[PDB]
PDB file of C-alpha atoms in Angstrom:
ATOM      1  CA  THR A   1     -29.352  21.493  21.554  1.00  0.00           C
ATOM      2  CA  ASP A   2     -26.503  23.359  22.141  1.00  0.00           C
ATOM      3  CA  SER A   3     -24.616  22.283  26.060  1.00  0.00           C
ATOM      4  CA  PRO A   4     -25.655  24.540  29.033  1.00  0.00           C
ATOM      5  CA  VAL A   5     -21.670  25.333  29.125  1.00  0.00           C
ATOM      6  CA  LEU A   6     -22.224  26.390  25.311  1.00  0.00           C
ATOM      7  CA  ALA A   7     -25.262  28.516  25.646  1.00  0.00           C
ATOM      8  CA  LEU A   8     -23.812  30.836  28.790  1.00  0.00           C
ATOM      9  CA  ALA A   9     -21.269  31.476  26.756  1.00  0.00           C
ATOM     10  CA  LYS A  10     -22.746  32.136  23.923  1.00  0.00           C
ATOM     11  CA  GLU A  11     -25.075  34.740  25.885  1.00  0.00           C
ATOM     12  CA  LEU A  12     -22.252  36.216  27.840  1.00  0.00           C
ATOM     13  CA  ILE A  13     -20.328  36.921  24.521  1.00  0.00           C
ATOM     14  CA  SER A  14     -23.456  39.182  23.126  1.00  0.00           C
ATOM     15  CA  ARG A  15     -23.050  41.246  25.742  1.00  0.00           C
ATOM     16  CA  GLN A  16     -20.827  43.851  25.545  1.00  0.00           C
ATOM     17  CA  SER A  17     -19.157  44.247  28.206  1.00  0.00           C
ATOM     18  CA  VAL A  18     -16.657  46.978  27.482  1.00  0.00           C
ATOM     19  CA  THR A  19     -14.706  48.201  30.576  1.00  0.00           C
ATOM     20  CA  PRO A  20     -16.119  49.231  32.783  1.00  0.00           C
ATOM     21  CA  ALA A  21     -19.987  48.552  31.401  1.00  0.00           C
ATOM     22  CA  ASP A  22     -21.205  45.335  32.476  1.00  0.00           C
ATOM     23  CA  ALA A  23     -24.308  45.081  29.000  1.00  0.00           C
ATOM     24  CA  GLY A  24     -25.972  42.340  32.522  1.00  0.00           C
ATOM     25  CA  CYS A  25     -23.542  39.549  32.258  1.00  0.00           C
ATOM     26  CA  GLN A  26     -23.765  39.879  36.412  1.00  0.00           C
ATOM     27  CA  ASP A  27     -27.361  40.158  36.058  1.00  0.00           C
ATOM     28  CA  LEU A  28     -27.282  36.468  33.788  1.00  0.00           C
ATOM     29  CA  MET A  29     -25.088  34.647  36.370  1.00  0.00           C
ATOM     30  CA  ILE A  30     -26.304  36.198  39.216  1.00  0.00           C
ATOM     31  CA  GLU A  31     -29.733  34.750  38.057  1.00  0.00           C
ATOM     32  CA  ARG A  32     -28.350  31.297  37.740  1.00  0.00           C
ATOM     33  CA  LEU A  33     -26.855  31.878  41.069  1.00  0.00           C
ATOM     34  CA  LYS A  34     -30.123  32.747  42.733  1.00  0.00           C
ATOM     35  CA  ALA A  35     -31.909  29.763  41.581  1.00  0.00           C
ATOM     36  CA  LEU A  36     -29.066  27.937  43.609  1.00  0.00           C
ATOM     37  CA  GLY A  37     -29.710  29.692  46.570  1.00  0.00           C
ATOM     38  CA  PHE A  38     -26.555  32.323  46.662  1.00  0.00           C
ATOM     39  CA  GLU A  39     -27.322  35.158  48.832  1.00  0.00           C
ATOM     40  CA  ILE A  40     -26.153  38.219  46.114  1.00  0.00           C
ATOM     41  CA  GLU A  41     -24.061  41.206  47.368  1.00  0.00           C
ATOM     42  CA  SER A  42     -23.843  43.691  44.362  1.00  0.00           C
ATOM     43  CA  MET A  43     -21.408  46.623  45.370  1.00  0.00           C
ATOM     44  CA  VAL A  44     -20.640  49.038  42.960  1.00  0.00           C
ATOM     45  CA  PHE A  45     -17.317  51.211  43.368  1.00  0.00           C
ATOM     46  CA  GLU A  46     -16.720  54.086  40.812  1.00  0.00           C
ATOM     47  CA  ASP A  47     -18.668  53.218  37.769  1.00  0.00           C
ATOM     48  CA  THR A  48     -17.863  49.794  37.740  1.00  0.00           C
ATOM     49  CA  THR A  49     -20.363  46.954  38.768  1.00  0.00           C
ATOM     50  CA  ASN A  50     -19.378  43.851  41.016  1.00  0.00           C
ATOM     51  CA  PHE A  51     -20.434  41.439  42.716  1.00  0.00           C
ATOM     52  CA  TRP A  52     -20.018  38.707  45.937  1.00  0.00           C
ATOM     53  CA  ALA A  53     -22.013  35.330  45.899  1.00  0.00           C
ATOM     54  CA  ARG A  54     -22.322  32.963  48.909  1.00  0.00           C
ATOM     55  CA  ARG A  55     -23.517  29.910  49.623  1.00  0.00           C
ATOM     56  CA  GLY A  56     -23.443  28.075  52.630  1.00  0.00           C
ATOM     57  CA  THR A  57     -22.080  29.255  55.727  1.00  0.00           C
ATOM     58  CA  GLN A  58     -19.648  26.475  56.742  1.00  0.00           C
ATOM     59  CA  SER A  59     -15.168  26.655  56.771  1.00  0.00           C
ATOM     60  CA  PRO A  60     -14.137  26.035  54.294  1.00  0.00           C
ATOM     61  CA  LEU A  61     -14.698  28.678  52.197  1.00  0.00           C
ATOM     62  CA  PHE A  62     -14.304  28.034  47.630  1.00  0.00           C
ATOM     63  CA  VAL A  63     -14.184  31.115  45.637  1.00  0.00           C
ATOM     64  CA  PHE A  64     -14.769  31.279  42.013  1.00  0.00           C
ATOM     65  CA  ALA A  65     -13.074  34.292  40.957  1.00  0.00           C
ATOM     66  CA  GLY A  66     -13.707  36.620  37.921  1.00  0.00           C
ATOM     67  CA  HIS A  67     -14.655  39.721  35.136  1.00  0.00           C
ATOM     68  CA  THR A  68     -17.438  39.968  32.925  1.00  0.00           C
ATOM     69  CA  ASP A  69     -15.464  43.140  31.352  1.00  0.00           C
ATOM     70  CA  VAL A  70     -13.617  42.668  27.639  1.00  0.00           C
ATOM     71  CA  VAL A  71     -11.325  44.825  25.871  1.00  0.00           C
ATOM     72  CA  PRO A  72     -12.298  46.478  23.126  1.00  0.00           C
ATOM     73  CA  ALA A  73     -12.514  44.478  19.765  1.00  0.00           C
ATOM     74  CA  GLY A  74     -10.089  46.786  18.079  1.00  0.00           C
ATOM     75  CA  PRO A  75     -10.806  47.191  13.562  1.00  0.00           C
ATOM     76  CA  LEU A  76     -13.080  45.203  12.237  1.00  0.00           C
ATOM     77  CA  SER A  77     -11.661  44.727   9.328  1.00  0.00           C
ATOM     78  CA  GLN A  78      -9.304  42.863  10.711  1.00  0.00           C
ATOM     79  CA  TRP A  79     -12.026  40.307  12.184  1.00  0.00           C
ATOM     80  CA  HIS A  80     -13.620  37.384  10.551  1.00  0.00           C
ATOM     81  CA  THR A  81     -16.265  37.060  12.630  1.00  0.00           C
ATOM     82  CA  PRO A  82     -18.597  39.877  14.310  1.00  0.00           C
ATOM     83  CA  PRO A  83     -16.246  40.492  17.809  1.00  0.00           C
ATOM     84  CA  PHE A  84     -19.592  40.487  19.502  1.00  0.00           C
ATOM     85  CA  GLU A  85     -21.680  37.840  17.972  1.00  0.00           C
ATOM     86  CA  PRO A  86     -20.618  34.643  19.088  1.00  0.00           C
ATOM     87  CA  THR A  87     -19.845  32.754  16.105  1.00  0.00           C
ATOM     88  CA  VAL A  88     -19.075  29.048  15.879  1.00  0.00           C
ATOM     89  CA  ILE A  89     -16.929  27.198  13.571  1.00  0.00           C
ATOM     90  CA  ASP A  90     -15.394  23.851  13.548  1.00  0.00           C
ATOM     91  CA  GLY A  91     -15.718  23.250  17.142  1.00  0.00           C
ATOM     92  CA  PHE A  92     -14.306  27.008  18.124  1.00  0.00           C
ATOM     93  CA  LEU A  93     -16.640  29.400  19.580  1.00  0.00           C
ATOM     94  CA  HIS A  94     -15.403  33.022  18.340  1.00  0.00           C
ATOM     95  CA  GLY A  95     -15.999  36.061  19.629  1.00  0.00           C
ATOM     96  CA  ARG A  96     -14.678  38.651  21.834  1.00  0.00           C
ATOM     97  CA  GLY A  97     -14.389  37.343  25.728  1.00  0.00           C
ATOM     98  CA  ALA A  98     -14.273  33.917  24.846  1.00  0.00           C
ATOM     99  CA  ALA A  99     -10.880  32.529  25.927  1.00  0.00           C
ATOM    100  CA  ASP A 100     -10.555  36.069  28.123  1.00  0.00           C
ATOM    101  CA  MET A 101     -13.161  34.986  30.299  1.00  0.00           C
ATOM    102  CA  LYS A 102     -16.879  34.653  29.717  1.00  0.00           C
ATOM    103  CA  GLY A 103     -15.822  30.734  28.794  1.00  0.00           C
ATOM    104  CA  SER A 104     -14.555  30.628  31.952  1.00  0.00           C
ATOM    105  CA  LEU A 105     -17.668  32.388  34.317  1.00  0.00           C
ATOM    106  CA  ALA A 106     -20.035  29.600  32.119  1.00  0.00           C
ATOM    107  CA  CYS A 107     -18.074  27.040  33.345  1.00  0.00           C
ATOM    108  CA  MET A 108     -17.896  28.377  36.789  1.00  0.00           C
ATOM    109  CA  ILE A 109     -21.215  28.292  36.863  1.00  0.00           C
ATOM    110  CA  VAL A 110     -22.310  25.319  35.361  1.00  0.00           C
ATOM    111  CA  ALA A 111     -20.192  23.320  37.320  1.00  0.00           C
ATOM    112  CA  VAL A 112     -21.567  24.741  40.780  1.00  0.00           C
ATOM    113  CA  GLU A 113     -24.652  23.945  39.435  1.00  0.00           C
ATOM    114  CA  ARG A 114     -23.689  20.014  38.589  1.00  0.00           C
ATOM    115  CA  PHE A 115     -22.157  20.878  41.829  1.00  0.00           C
ATOM    116  CA  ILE A 116     -25.351  20.661  43.401  1.00  0.00           C
ATOM    117  CA  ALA A 117     -27.313  19.129  42.014  1.00  0.00           C
ATOM    118  CA  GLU A 118     -25.099  15.749  43.164  1.00  0.00           C
ATOM    119  CA  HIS A 119     -24.222  17.720  47.111  1.00  0.00           C
ATOM    120  CA  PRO A 120     -26.847  20.317  48.116  1.00  0.00           C
ATOM    121  CA  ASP A 121     -25.890  19.410  51.932  1.00  0.00           C
ATOM    122  CA  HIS A 122     -22.090  19.828  50.684  1.00  0.00           C
ATOM    123  CA  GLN A 123     -19.416  20.822  52.997  1.00  0.00           C
ATOM    124  CA  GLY A 124     -17.910  24.436  53.234  1.00  0.00           C
ATOM    125  CA  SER A 125     -19.143  28.058  51.442  1.00  0.00           C
ATOM    126  CA  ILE A 126     -18.957  28.451  47.908  1.00  0.00           C
ATOM    127  CA  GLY A 127     -18.413  31.987  47.045  1.00  0.00           C
ATOM    128  CA  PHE A 128     -18.125  34.210  43.464  1.00  0.00           C
ATOM    129  CA  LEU A 129     -16.551  37.328  43.035  1.00  0.00           C
ATOM    130  CA  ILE A 130     -16.965  38.869  40.253  1.00  0.00           C
ATOM    131  CA  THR A 131     -16.062  42.571  38.745  1.00  0.00           C
ATOM    132  CA  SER A 132     -16.289  44.517  35.744  1.00  0.00           C
ATOM    133  CA  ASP A 133     -13.357  46.628  35.615  1.00  0.00           C
ATOM    134  CA  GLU A 134     -10.128  43.929  35.091  1.00  0.00           C
ATOM    135  CA  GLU A 135      -9.412  45.061  31.423  1.00  0.00           C
ATOM    136  CA  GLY A 136      -9.957  48.637  31.948  1.00  0.00           C
ATOM    137  CA  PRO A 137      -7.096  51.445  32.990  1.00  0.00           C
ATOM    138  CA  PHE A 138      -9.571  51.296  37.453  1.00  0.00           C
ATOM    139  CA  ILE A 139      -8.861  47.799  38.726  1.00  0.00           C
ATOM    140  CA  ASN A 140     -10.572  48.369  41.967  1.00  0.00           C
ATOM    141  CA  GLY A 141     -13.100  46.274  41.913  1.00  0.00           C
ATOM    142  CA  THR A 142     -11.858  43.472  43.703  1.00  0.00           C
ATOM    143  CA  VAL A 143      -9.446  45.199  45.930  1.00  0.00           C
ATOM    144  CA  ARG A 144     -12.643  46.736  47.175  1.00  0.00           C
ATOM    145  CA  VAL A 145     -14.516  43.277  47.777  1.00  0.00           C
ATOM    146  CA  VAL A 146     -11.877  42.085  49.441  1.00  0.00           C
ATOM    147  CA  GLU A 147     -11.698  44.730  51.826  1.00  0.00           C
ATOM    148  CA  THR A 148     -15.362  44.564  52.714  1.00  0.00           C
ATOM    149  CA  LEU A 149     -15.314  41.217  53.255  1.00  0.00           C
ATOM    150  CA  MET A 150     -12.048  41.627  55.526  1.00  0.00           C
ATOM    151  CA  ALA A 151     -13.649  44.405  57.417  1.00  0.00           C
ATOM    152  CA  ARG A 152     -16.801  41.718  58.247  1.00  0.00           C
ATOM    153  CA  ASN A 153     -14.173  39.214  58.986  1.00  0.00           C
ATOM    154  CA  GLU A 154     -15.044  36.880  56.093  1.00  0.00           C
ATOM    155  CA  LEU A 155     -12.027  35.402  55.252  1.00  0.00           C
ATOM    156  CA  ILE A 156     -11.833  33.763  52.001  1.00  0.00           C
ATOM    157  CA  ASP A 157     -10.069  30.512  52.326  1.00  0.00           C
ATOM    158  CA  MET A 158      -9.093  28.488  48.944  1.00  0.00           C
ATOM    159  CA  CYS A 159     -10.073  30.823  45.261  1.00  0.00           C
ATOM    160  CA  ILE A 160      -9.363  29.584  41.664  1.00  0.00           C
ATOM    161  CA  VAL A 161      -9.179  32.408  39.071  1.00  0.00           C
ATOM    162  CA  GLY A 162      -9.860  31.455  36.031  1.00  0.00           C
ATOM    163  CA  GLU A 163      -8.089  33.538  34.293  1.00  0.00           C
ATOM    164  CA  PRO A 164      -7.122  31.889  30.697  1.00  0.00           C
ATOM    165  CA  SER A 165      -3.843  30.304  32.558  1.00  0.00           C
ATOM    166  CA  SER A 166      -3.099  27.429  29.370  1.00  0.00           C
ATOM    167  CA  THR A 167      -0.652  26.677  26.516  1.00  0.00           C
ATOM    168  CA  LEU A 168      -2.156  24.567  24.552  1.00  0.00           C
ATOM    169  CA  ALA A 169      -4.633  22.865  25.722  1.00  0.00           C
ATOM    170  CA  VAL A 170      -6.451  23.865  28.721  1.00  0.00           C
ATOM    171  CA  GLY A 171      -5.109  22.260  31.660  1.00  0.00           C
ATOM    172  CA  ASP A 172      -1.698  22.500  30.492  1.00  0.00           C
ATOM    173  CA  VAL A 173      -0.238  24.963  32.929  1.00  0.00           C
ATOM    174  CA  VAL A 174      -1.775  26.174  36.742  1.00  0.00           C
ATOM    175  CA  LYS A 175      -0.319  28.918  38.013  1.00  0.00           C
ATOM    176  CA  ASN A 176      -0.383  28.895  42.512  1.00  0.00           C
ATOM    177  CA  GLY A 177      -0.551  31.471  44.756  1.00  0.00           C
ATOM    178  CA  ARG A 178       1.866  32.018  47.152  1.00  0.00           C
ATOM    179  CA  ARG A 179      -0.723  32.460  50.559  1.00  0.00           C
ATOM    180  CA  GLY A 180       0.296  35.735  52.504  1.00  0.00           C
ATOM    181  CA  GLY A 181       2.278  36.480  49.775  1.00  0.00           C
ATOM    182  CA  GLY A 182       4.734  33.325  50.919  1.00  0.00           C
ATOM    183  CA  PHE A 183       4.259  33.767  54.493  1.00  0.00           C
ATOM    184  CA  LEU A 184       1.188  32.017  55.786  1.00  0.00           C
ATOM    185  CA  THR A 185       1.029  28.461  56.595  1.00  0.00           C
ATOM    186  CA  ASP A 186       0.033  26.699  53.456  1.00  0.00           C
ATOM    187  CA  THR A 187      -1.326  23.578  53.423  1.00  0.00           C
ATOM    188  CA  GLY A 188      -1.748  22.772  49.576  1.00  0.00           C
ATOM    189  CA  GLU A 189      -5.421  21.418  49.758  1.00  0.00           C
ATOM    190  CA  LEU A 190      -6.432  23.645  46.821  1.00  0.00           C
ATOM    191  CA  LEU A 191      -2.994  22.916  44.562  1.00  0.00           C
ATOM    192  CA  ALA A 192      -3.895  19.305  45.540  1.00  0.00           C
ATOM    193  CA  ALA A 193      -7.551  19.572  44.361  1.00  0.00           C
ATOM    194  CA  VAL A 194      -7.177  21.100  41.598  1.00  0.00           C
ATOM    195  CA  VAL A 195      -3.678  18.729  40.299  1.00  0.00           C
ATOM    196  CA  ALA A 196      -6.086  15.684  41.095  1.00  0.00           C
ATOM    197  CA  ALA A 197      -9.383  17.218  39.324  1.00  0.00           C
ATOM    198  CA  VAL A 198      -7.076  18.518  36.015  1.00  0.00           C
ATOM    199  CA  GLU A 199      -5.470  15.097  35.844  1.00  0.00           C
ATOM    200  CA  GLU A 200      -8.541  13.088  36.210  1.00  0.00           C
ATOM    201  CA  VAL A 201      -9.928  15.176  33.244  1.00  0.00           C
ATOM    202  CA  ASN A 202      -6.915  14.560  31.023  1.00  0.00           C
ATOM    203  CA  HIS A 203      -4.988  11.942  32.408  1.00  0.00           C
ATOM    204  CA  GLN A 204      -1.595  14.964  33.241  1.00  0.00           C
ATOM    205  CA  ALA A 205      -0.734  16.586  35.778  1.00  0.00           C
ATOM    206  CA  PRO A 206      -0.800  20.280  34.602  1.00  0.00           C
ATOM    207  CA  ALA A 207       2.631  22.093  34.577  1.00  0.00           C
ATOM    208  CA  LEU A 208       3.145  24.982  37.301  1.00  0.00           C
ATOM    209  CA  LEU A 209       3.987  29.000  37.794  1.00  0.00           C
ATOM    210  CA  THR A 210       4.726  30.461  41.173  1.00  0.00           C
ATOM    211  CA  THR A 211       5.379  33.548  39.746  1.00  0.00           C
ATOM    212  CA  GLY A 212       2.979  35.966  37.237  1.00  0.00           C
ATOM    213  CA  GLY A 213      -1.220  35.667  37.457  1.00  0.00           C
ATOM    214  CA  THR A 214      -3.043  39.017  38.347  1.00  0.00           C
ATOM    215  CA  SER A 215      -2.969  41.635  40.509  1.00  0.00           C
ATOM    216  CA  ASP A 216      -6.310  40.858  41.842  1.00  0.00           C
ATOM    217  CA  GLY A 217      -6.173  36.763  42.641  1.00  0.00           C
ATOM    218  CA  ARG A 218      -1.912  38.028  44.206  1.00  0.00           C
ATOM    219  CA  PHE A 219      -4.195  39.980  46.360  1.00  0.00           C
ATOM    220  CA  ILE A 220      -6.759  37.731  47.230  1.00  0.00           C
ATOM    221  CA  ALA A 221      -3.762  35.820  47.883  1.00  0.00           C
ATOM    222  CA  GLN A 222      -1.972  38.283  49.844  1.00  0.00           C
ATOM    223  CA  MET A 223      -4.628  38.779  52.287  1.00  0.00           C
ATOM    224  CA  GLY A 224      -4.974  35.095  53.036  1.00  0.00           C
ATOM    225  CA  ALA A 225      -6.574  32.991  50.547  1.00  0.00           C
ATOM    226  CA  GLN A 226      -4.942  30.073  48.558  1.00  0.00           C
ATOM    227  CA  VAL A 227      -5.366  31.011  45.453  1.00  0.00           C
ATOM    228  CA  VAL A 228      -4.927  28.878  41.359  1.00  0.00           C
ATOM    229  CA  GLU A 229      -5.297  30.513  38.453  1.00  0.00           C
ATOM    230  CA  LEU A 230      -7.127  27.976  36.217  1.00  0.00           C
ATOM    231  CA  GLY A 231      -8.544  28.751  32.507  1.00  0.00           C
ATOM    232  CA  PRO A 232      -8.941  28.270  28.910  1.00  0.00           C
ATOM    233  CA  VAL A 233      -5.355  27.936  25.865  1.00  0.00           C
ATOM    234  CA  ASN A 234      -4.247  32.537  26.357  1.00  0.00           C
ATOM    235  CA  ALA A 235      -3.124  32.286  22.827  1.00  0.00           C
ATOM    236  CA  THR A 236      -5.747  35.134  21.133  1.00  0.00           C
ATOM    237  CA  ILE A 237      -7.098  37.059  24.210  1.00  0.00           C
ATOM    238  CA  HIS A 238      -6.880  40.586  23.570  1.00  0.00           C
ATOM    239  CA  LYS A 239      -6.089  39.937  19.741  1.00  0.00           C
ATOM    240  CA  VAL A 240      -8.229  40.372  16.687  1.00  0.00           C
ATOM    241  CA  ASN A 241     -10.537  36.786  15.719  1.00  0.00           C
ATOM    242  CA  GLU A 242     -10.166  35.796  19.974  1.00  0.00           C
ATOM    243  CA  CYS A 243     -11.410  32.288  20.071  1.00  0.00           C
ATOM    244  CA  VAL A 244     -11.745  29.316  22.843  1.00  0.00           C
ATOM    245  CA  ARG A 245     -12.141  25.561  21.954  1.00  0.00           C
ATOM    246  CA  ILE A 246     -15.752  24.161  22.950  1.00  0.00           C
ATOM    247  CA  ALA A 247     -14.536  21.055  23.881  1.00  0.00           C
ATOM    248  CA  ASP A 248     -12.121  22.743  26.410  1.00  0.00           C
ATOM    249  CA  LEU A 249     -15.574  24.488  27.904  1.00  0.00           C
ATOM    250  CA  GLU A 250     -16.524  21.173  28.158  1.00  0.00           C
ATOM    251  CA  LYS A 251     -13.403  19.869  29.727  1.00  0.00           C
ATOM    252  CA  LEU A 252     -12.435  23.006  32.066  1.00  0.00           C
ATOM    253  CA  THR A 253     -15.668  22.470  33.440  1.00  0.00           C
ATOM    254  CA  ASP A 254     -15.871  18.787  34.673  1.00  0.00           C
ATOM    255  CA  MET A 255     -12.079  20.215  35.634  1.00  0.00           C
ATOM    256  CA  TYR A 256     -13.912  23.306  38.461  1.00  0.00           C
ATOM    257  CA  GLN A 257     -16.772  19.844  38.932  1.00  0.00           C
ATOM    258  CA  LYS A 258     -14.356  17.792  39.782  1.00  0.00           C
ATOM    259  CA  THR A 259     -11.871  20.708  42.382  1.00  0.00           C
ATOM    260  CA  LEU A 260     -15.569  21.081  44.329  1.00  0.00           C
ATOM    261  CA  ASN A 261     -15.632  17.821  44.733  1.00  0.00           C
ATOM    262  CA  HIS A 262     -12.401  17.225  46.265  1.00  0.00           C
ATOM    263  CA  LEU A 263     -12.780  20.038  48.736  1.00  0.00           C
ATOM    264  CA  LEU A 264     -17.109  20.460  50.066  1.00  0.00           C
ATOM    265  CA  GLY A 265     -18.372  16.438  48.598  1.00  0.00           C
TER     266      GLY A 265
END
């Protein structure tokens, strides 16, 4: 019986969320978060769907951010497997969005489930900031949501963007935002927690980048949050035969869980 991580990642991969359509991926995530006691606000901007969820009312507010949309498959004759049919071959999960970034999304949900099972009375607060337009021409959701939050004085302290950051092995490389773009005091709390988690799992510190990363993560950073990008191997993103090592999804989930333990446990 599939691990919960593999099961959810397969669910998500079967929904044809070619941008900006969502095929119910956020609804799947929202269902799981409702069970955990998150409040949910779905926000529509242009014809894209987004949501914010939050459990807890105390500082620090830690957020998982990502997107449910994927690029189109491209020419079928080049695929060995159906792009929107999650296919398991010799320990890899093939399908559009397996690496960018439905596998990460599944890991975030299972991590928070596991963390909450162990720490129902955690410190701080956990949030999810999920968009469906990151892979499209018109990348609006994150900016609009962040603005909504900022306007009600709901400031995100720390955020993991689960974009596929890694080269050969999950967690070999992380990307670190400049808080306030380099202009606000930065404790390093998040980076030290994600690094601790990556070392607990891999027994090796990740390599670090301080540049690059998505425009949405950079916006979350500019506005005030410590941000780290950590996710699976990125070799096959936006290529045919996109896939992800399943054991790496299991690891990544543990890394996410250990970060929550460090920050909120």
